[PDB]
Amino acid sequence: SERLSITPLGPYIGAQISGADLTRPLSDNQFEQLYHAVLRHQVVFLRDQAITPQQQRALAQRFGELHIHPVYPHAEGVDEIIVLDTHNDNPPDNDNWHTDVTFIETPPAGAILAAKELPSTGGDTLWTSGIAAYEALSVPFRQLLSGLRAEHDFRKSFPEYKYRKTEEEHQRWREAVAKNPPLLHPVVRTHPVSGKQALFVNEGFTTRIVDVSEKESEALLSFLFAHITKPEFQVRWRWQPNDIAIWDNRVTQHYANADYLPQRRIMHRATILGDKPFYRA
Template sequence: MTLHIQALGPAIGALVTGIDLTQPVSDAQRDALLAGLLQHHVLFFENQPVTPVQQRDLARRFGELHIHPVYPTHPDAVEIIVLDTDDNNPPDNDNWHTDVTFIDKPPMGALLSARHLPPSGGDTLWASGIAAYEALSEPLRKLLDPLHAEHSFVQSFPAWRYARTPEERKVWESAAAKYPDIPHPVVRTHPVSGKRGLFVNEGFTSRIVELDKKESDAILAFLRVHIAKPEFTVRWRWKQYDLAFWDNRLTQHYATVDYLPHRRVMHRATVLGDVPY
């Protein structure tokens, strides 16, 4: 097979064919995928029935893996998050977010596999923080460039949802203590491409440090609306065993919740990154 990467839009997204991810990925294939990720920000693969162990091993080809502090994980591979949602366990990711920005070295990327899908719905959208930043006026870019924003674990994982039992409370309190609010640049530089992009998101960003509350709330509200403009996004309609691999450093994503009461199960492996600057 010959690996081929076809763009799905000018700002973000590409479909990858000519590769079997259930088999070990060669160095040449890994390098080609990283180059495609750098250009397109999110790569989609169809009909890739990887097991949790295969997905973990694939993700390890791109770096050290993160183990989530509160999400359930797969018994065969603790590095694989199991996102199993239905009417009794509604999802919490129907907002624009960048994964795990509440740590000092947020993930460089993530690999998401569709395991069980509803009859319809449950699409995921990704947005390019680079395209959104470059579309801003020069005065606004200059305002944002030196600013920092705090990212909060408890904002995205509140106690009322994740500490409902004594056992959950113990895990949640440990995570909340381990991950206090942490500042990151509002505009981040991609460590490989050198491009600049927005690095604030609805899921985790609580405030802009250098601004007062009203100013911070107004700027963050504007940026949340701005990055969701269709021209900065790509939408993927999942089929079973589809897999997405995205650059988490300067993208956001949104999982639509239009499938309840039906069930949706996704497996995610998360590759750790570096300190944003």
């Protein structure tokens, strides 16, 4: 375990990491700086990492317990690794700004994404920094949003109408909804580790801010859903087979382009549980 090559991709978010073989267990010195690079850069990219669901689950396991998605398919024999196999018969549903599974009480602290099969071109994935977004807010707006709570609803990104192909798929949806009722989370979240304040709403699951009026909420979310799309808060990644992406899901949102069908695209994701999102001034 020497020293990983960390190349920032921007001033506020993103970095490429080289010198870490993810197919084989990482030493402690390496896993530590990989961990810190993720916290520091919010999202890191490692190319040429032909890992299997096995080792991917293993790597994620080291960050903590893994979440099992209520609707997405999982890899054979490895229930924690969801398979994102998109094509004509399963159109991509991630071309919207979202933070992974914020519909549970303890949203994932992070995730590891592996590019298995990719289209000739397209399918880029973008990440936006809730930290940079928060920093870009004027003091009056930071004060306004801090302490407010917003509702997150699993159904916003998982509409029932999208799961009625087969009765099985529909049943899977029913069980998912029953187990994931709408819940509240701070609009401004204090990172549990770094202490940095970050915007913590995402168009994918955030339905409304409950501490203001309905029109006030729509006005704020309208602003926020646009605010986070500022180029300066982002890093855009063009995928290559066997790429690996690891991000801190506590302070970022990502968006996956849906510009490749009829071509097929297969991604594998390990999802690391986090703790209860909170805000501390």
